[PDB]
Ligand binder design. Sequence first.
Ligand SMILES: NC(=O)c1ccc[n+]([C@@H]2O[C@H](COP(=O)([O-])OP(=O)(O)OC[C@H]3O[C@@H](n4cnc5c(N)ncnc54)[C@H](OP(=O)(O)O)[C@@H]3O)[C@@H](O)[C@H]2O)c1
Length: 323
Amino acid sequence: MDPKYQRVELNDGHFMPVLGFGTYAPPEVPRNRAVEVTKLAIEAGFRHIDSAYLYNNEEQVGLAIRSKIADGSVKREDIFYTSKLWCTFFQPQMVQPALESSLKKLQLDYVDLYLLHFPMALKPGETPLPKDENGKVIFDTVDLSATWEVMEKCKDAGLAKSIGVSNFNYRQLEMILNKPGLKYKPVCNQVECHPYLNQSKLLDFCKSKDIVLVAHSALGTQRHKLWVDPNSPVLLEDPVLCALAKKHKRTPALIALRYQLQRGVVVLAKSYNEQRIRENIQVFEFQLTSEDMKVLDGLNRNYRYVVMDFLMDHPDYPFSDEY
Ligand SMILES: NC(=O)c1ccc[n+]([C@@H]2O[C@H](COP(=O)([O-])OP(=O)(O)OC[C@H]3O[C@@H](n4cnc5c(N)ncnc54)[C@H](OP(=O)(O)O)[C@@H]3O)[C@@H](O)[C@H]2O)c1
């Protein structure tokens, strides 16, 4: 009943909180930090928690969740936990073991959401980005419809409450939506989304197909060189974002998060700082005017931060299509 607990109904009948906590930290950050900041996020009132095999943190995020069930009280049903199937486990016979492996590290019985992390299959193995003798990433060929059938099987087995996708384009989503014998459609498409890349067209598509758009990188990314060019423009330093922040006596980050809430986008926010974690949940304590939203819509410039350019030659690279 406190606005911060607001949820949206998914196309499978389950409910997803509209604000999520992003948990990815680059490898240099101490592993035990994820435990502390996830506990802090739950204390702040975050209930939707986003992770993945790739983030190498599920043991730590699971510990924080279970500790807060044991006590800083939440109940399991109050938490909405997302994991993601990484590209090297897209072959049908390794989809379910990949989920069960994540659940073993988490020490939870189910995930609330399990996503295909990208539409791109990579060579099976222990290295997430497997490379050849020239340092080019090695690709794999998989029918994504067969991968999706095993995701459906995981939902039927009770191991994932809901299933979805991440970083899919409209034609790729359509390949799943128009699959013969489809049992469960994606609940969501988690994509990069912020005022410089507002995803109008993909958002319209998703809404027309009863798929939730979930915004990652909603504050312009953490700007880490593994994934993001440091010469790229700094979203939160934008003088128009800052002028609206000041008008509202908030911060640029809060403006960027509120933008998404008011357009019907579910939004993630990563912070490993206690004060900013507590600040971010204040997105529910103010409103942008319709005039503010039209100005924010005018910041759109089709600028993508997470380009994954070392995967540009993959047949199923998602970002070369218009949307
Ligand atoms: N599916 C995918 O392919 C994919 C890709 C990228 C990300 N994600 C998910 O999306 C989550 C969010 O992405 P992200 O971590 O790249 O970036 P983000 O949420 O766009 O932004 C995080 C950056 O904003 C800073 N920040 C947070 N709150 C702030 C505030 N109130 N004021 C000023 N700065 C603030 C953070 O620093 P501090 O930590 O110091 O507070 C961090 O450097 C990830 O954790 C992950 O869960 C998914």
